[PDB]
Structure formats: structure tokens, C-alpha cells
């Protein structure tokens, strides 16, 4: 990019500019905190064939969670930060919607991105994942999406990068058994033996060979949700999640055949704090989850 | 393992002329306000650094001349002076180490 901003600023304008940026961002967020008050477009009811908008949370860490049956179940952490809609585009094969996530400084960005994010409220985000939504649910840009969008007892898919191990060898990249230590190896312990046949003077495309492991987007299907938080906007999903800690992850509804027609009890468009909606408790629990503070279990 | 066919001059030229191997031009050369010896960003000057090094070497030589033999390291601070200049009333116990030199236009 061009010349970084912190170059022609004295020792007195840096903190002033920082405070001004923070105040402007906070004011924009507070102004956009009211979606229903502004034109929210007509809201449609639930239909058999129709999807909803997802979220983009941050993978904090992991912690265990015991169920009522007395069994250990690993659970992940997903912090829904801001998560606002950028724009909307109709017919490609189906409608699309852009969603952001974390709040990245608006100094190390392209002029086009800065102009696009200035046309709308809020500051520029980090990533922009496009979701393939139907024509039914259509939320206006600039609206927030907290963790209340999802509810317990639901399978939600997650996709994100992975802890890239760089250009790895062969065993760690594909799980090859390599060669023995003795009888009678001298320089062969992790190398790949034969390629493929002999007469074939070529190499079958896609053959397992040393390459850059990880550092790619991989989706996981079949992940149940146990508990959700409203204050901190945290989502606790079962099983691990691709990507390192403090890494943005794309989350949306599942796609399996056994979990497709069950969004009747879920909010078809998105959760709206302003209501005319009856606020939810501090955190919704599940039917098969040991609540924090409840008496000890007893299989009698 | 051995070359089966010598690389042609065209192939050699194409290999030793791509932008990936050519020296990448840099644009991080500014003008130093002191002595204008075109310094680099995030890096100190050249003539000023040499002057500071010479001054530090002279100060160390003077300290050694005053300290004497090795294995000393007194438990008192230091104060550098120049021609004239009465010692500061605040630093009276600190050992003064100097000889003969004029205060330059960049030392406090």
C-alpha cells in the first residue's frame, strides 16, 4: 500500500486522532444498534424451502461440558462480535448476502474498500463471507446479528482455515508409514519410496507428494449446539472447529438431509432485540445439559 | 543426475532475467536533516552515528585513563563536561571524567 498514516503526525496528534477514531466508531455502532427502528423491509414467515443468514464468530478456546447422562462432551467457543450485513444482491443462481465480523483498523485498507464502507455505517470489518440465501429472508444491510440468532438443540456447520504446517514432508501430510529404522535402511526413513509403476514415465496428477499442509478452508458437518450466551454473545458448539484460536470462522445453517426441515421454532429472519419480542434469559440451556449450580446428578 | 542436454543461451537468459531474480528497487531513502547524508527510514544516520561512536570511544579512553587498571567499576554515576563549564551544583559527588574538548552543536 501507500505511505502509512503514522508518518507525518507529531507527538500530540496521534492520541487525539486515536480518540476521534474510537469515538466515531462507537457513535456509528450506537446509531446502527437500532435495526427495527429503521426501515427493516417486509418480514416473511417460515416456509418449507428457505434458509437464513449465518454468523461470523471468533474461535476463542475450548472447554468441556457434561450432559445429564453423565458423559464428557467437548465444546468449542464462538464469540459473535458485531456481525453486520454489508449489502444484498439478487439474481446468480440464488440471492446472496455479505456479512462481516471483527473491527479492523480503517488505516491499512484499500481506497475502494474505504469508500464502500463509508457509503454505509459502521467501520470496515476483516473478512466478508457471502452466504447463499433464498429470496424469502432478506434483511436490510447495516443490521446486527448477535448470538441469539441460533438456539440450542440445533446442528450448525462451521468452516474456517486450519493451523497450516507449512510445506510439510510426506508422513505428516498424508500419514504414510515411511520406512523402517533398521534392516536395512541407511538414508530412507521418511522419504516416499516408489511413485507409481515403472513403464509409465509420467506421474499421476493428484498423487500424494510433499506440499503445503493446512492453511485452507474446510467445513465440518454435524455439530450440535449446547448452550448460548446473550450478554457476551457467545455460541458453544459441540466438537472442535477448524482454525486456530482468535480466528474468524464462518457459521451458517447445516445442510444434511435429516436436518433441513426443522427451522419452525427458530427465527426465520433474525433475532431482534427491540421488542415486542420478550427478551431471553441470561443464557438458554438445553434439555440434556448439566446447568451451572444445579444439584448433583443421581442415576437412582 | 548429470545434464542430458546443455541449457541453451535463450533458456539461460530467461532464467537469469526474470523479475523474481532481479534486484528489487527500494524506495526507503530519505534526506537526513543533519549533514544531509541521505539516511534510510527506521535506521539511524551515517555521519552522525560515526560522530557518536568517536565521542563514545574518546569518553571510554578518558574513563580508562582515569580509572587506571582493570577490574574497577565504581559504584558512582558519571558526568561529562567540556572546556570550562563549572560543574553542576546537583552533581557534586559524581566522579567527573573529561579532559579537553568543546561542546558540539548537538550535545546537552
Amino acid at each position: 500500500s501507500g505511505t502509512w498514516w503514522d508518518e507525518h503526525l507529531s507527538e500530540e496528534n496521534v492520541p487525539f486522532i486515536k480518540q476521534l477514531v474510537s469515538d466515531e466508531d462507537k457513535a456509528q455502532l450506537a446509531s446502527k444498534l437500532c435495526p427495527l427502528k429503521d426501515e427493516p423491509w417486509p418480514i416473511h414467515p417460515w416456509e418449507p424451502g428457505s434458509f437464513r443468514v449465518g454468523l461470523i464468530a471468533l474461535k476463542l478456546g475450548m472447554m468441556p461440558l457434561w450432559t445429564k447422562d453423565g458423559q464428557k462432551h467437548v465444546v468449542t467457543l464462538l464469540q459473535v462480535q458485531d456481525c453486520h450485513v454489508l449489502k444484498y444482491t439478487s439474481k446468480g443462481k440464488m440471492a446472496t448476502l455479505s456479512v462481516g465480523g471483527k473491527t479492523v483498523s480503517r488505516f491499512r485498507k484499500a481506497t475502494s474498500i474505504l469508500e464502500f464502507y463509508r457509503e454505509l455505517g459502521l467501520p470496515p470489518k476483516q473478512t466478508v463471507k457471502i452466504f447463499n440465501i433464498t429470496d424469502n429472508a432478506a434483511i436490510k444491510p447495516g443490521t446486527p446479528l448477535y448470538a441469539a440468532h441460533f438456539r440450542p438443540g440445533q446442528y450448525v456447520d462451521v468452516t474456517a482455515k486450519t493451523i497450516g504446517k507449512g510445506f510439510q514432508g510426506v508422513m505428516k501430510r498424508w500419514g504414510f508409514k515411511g520406512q523402517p529404522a533398521t534392516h536395512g535402511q541407511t538414508k530412507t526413513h521418511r522419504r516416499p519410496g516408489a511413485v507409481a509403476t515403472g513403464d509409465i514415465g509420467r506421474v499421476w496428477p493428484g498423487t500424494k507428494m510433499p506440499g503445503k499442509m493446512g492453511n485452507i478452508y474446510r467445513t465440518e458437518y454435524g455439530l450440535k449446539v449446547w448452550r448460548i450466551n446473550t450478554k457476551h454473545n457467545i455460541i458453544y458448539v459441540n466438537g472442535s472447529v477448524p482454525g486456530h484460536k482468535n480466528c474468524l470462522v464462518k457459521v451458517k445453517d447445516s445442510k444434511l438431509p435429516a436436518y433441513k426441515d426443522l427451522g419452525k421454532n427458530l427465527p426465520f429472519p433474525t433475532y431482534f432485540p427491540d421488542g415486542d419480542e420478550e427478551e431471553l434469559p441470561e443464557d438458554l440451556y438445553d434439555e440434556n445439559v448439566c446447568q451451572p449450580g444445579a444439584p448433583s446428578i443421581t442415576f437412582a | 543426475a548429470a545434464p542430458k542436454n546443455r541449457r541453451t543461451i535463450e533458456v539461460n537468459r530467461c532464467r537469469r532475467r526474470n523479475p523474481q531474480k532481479l534486484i528489487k528497487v527500494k524506495n526507503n531513502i530519505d534526506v537526513c536533516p543533519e549533514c544531509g547524508h541521505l539516511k534510510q527510514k527506521h535506521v539511524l544516520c551515517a555521519y552522525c552515528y560515526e560522530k557518536v561512536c568517536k565521542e563514545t570511544a574518546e569518553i571510554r579512553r578518558q574513563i580508562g585513563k582515569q580509572e587506571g587498571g582493570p577490574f574497577k567499576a565504581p559504584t558512582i554515576e558519571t558526568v561529562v563536561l567540556y572546556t570550562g563549564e563549572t560543574p553542576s551544583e546537583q552533581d557534586q559527588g559524581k566522579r567527573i571524567i573529561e579532559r579537553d574538548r568543546k561542546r558540539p552543536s548537538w550535545f546537552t
Partner: protein, 166 residues
């Protein structure tokens, strides 16, 4: 042996007339016998071609290469000779026009392998030529836009005649 770059500095042109251009003054200078390779010298020359003398010296003063100091000294000597001998007032109004680097007279030594053999170890020597032309540097040839490509295509399609007939 063949010294010519040093003799080119003695070329004399007839006296110009009032109704004629200024004719930018050309400079020639080179150092013989340089304990250095030739590929790196050619790399440095290619790096310093379209740039001016000031930018060239600025890039050389921060180029981690043995030949950088040699090229800087050569450019300084050429600038001094141009300001003194060739008669030039402006010191920064000079730009590089030609820059090459050929091999020199190499010797031979022995390396001694790990057996009853060996190999010739030539002492690679090189040179360095530079041509500084008076006046500011010319602008770089910009990339032909789509309009130029369309015009060339139209010209090629219009400049076609029937083949194999009258």
C-alpha cells in the same frame, strides 16, 4: 587486450550553428581489472539504467554487494571528470544511458579433490562501463493501452491483400 572506452572520450565534433539543438554531452568511463564476477555486475548495471545519477548513488549506498562501492566510486569519478574535463555545470542533470560488464583476464589455480584428480580454478575478473548523457532522464515507455492494441489490429486487418492471384 582492447582499450576503446577510454579513447572514445577524445571524440571531437565540429562547431554547432545557432539554428541547431543543444546536443546532450556524452560521458565515458570504466575501471579495468576488478576482482569480482560478471553476472552480479550485469545485475547491478540493469538495476542502474533508467534511473538518474542521484537515485543510482542512493541505491548503491544501500546495496549489500561488493560491487556496489566500486560502481559508486566509478560514478563519482565520472561525474567529477564530466564537471571538470568535459565541461558541465549541472551535477544532478546526468542520467545513465548504457551500462555493461564483461569478463577480464582470468588466471588458473588448483582445488585438489578428495582423490587423485583436480579441477581448474579460474580467477574470474570483470570490468564495468557506464555512459552518462547530459540532460534529464527520459520517461519510461508506458504500456500500450487497449486503444493502441485496437488500432494495431485494425491496421493489420486493413493492410491485407489477396494472396495467390493477380
Amino acid at each position: 587486450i582492447s582499450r576503446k572506452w577510454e579513447k572514445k572520450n577524445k571524440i571531437v565534433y565540429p562547431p554547432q550553428l545557432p539554428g541547431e539543438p543543444r546536443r546532450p554531452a556524452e560521458i565515458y568511463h570504466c575501471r579495468r581489472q576488478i576482482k569480482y564476477s560478471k553476472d552480479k555486475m550485469w545485475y547491478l548495471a540493469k538495476l542502474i539504467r533508467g534511473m538518474s545519477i542521484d537515485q543510482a548513488l542512493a541505491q548503491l549506498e544501500f546495496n549489500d554487494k561488493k560491487g556496489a562501492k566500486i560502481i559508486k566510486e566509478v560514478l563519482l569519478e565520472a561525474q567529477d571528470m564530466a564537471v571538470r574535463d568535459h565541461n558541465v555545470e549541472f551535477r544532478s542533470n546526468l542520467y545513465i544511458a548504457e551500462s555493461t560488464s564483461g569478463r577480464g583476464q582470468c588466471l588458473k589455480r588448483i582445488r585438489y579433490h578428495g582423490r587423485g584428480r583436480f579441477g581448474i580454478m579460474e580467477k574470474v575478473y570483470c570490468h564495468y562501463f557506464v555512459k552518462l548523457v547530459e540532460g534529464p532522464p527520459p520517461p519510461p515507455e508506458p504500456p500500450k493501452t487497449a486503444v493502441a492494441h485496437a488500432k494495431e489490429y485494425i491496421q493489420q486487418l486493413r493492410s491485407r491483400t489477396i494472396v495467390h492471384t493477380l
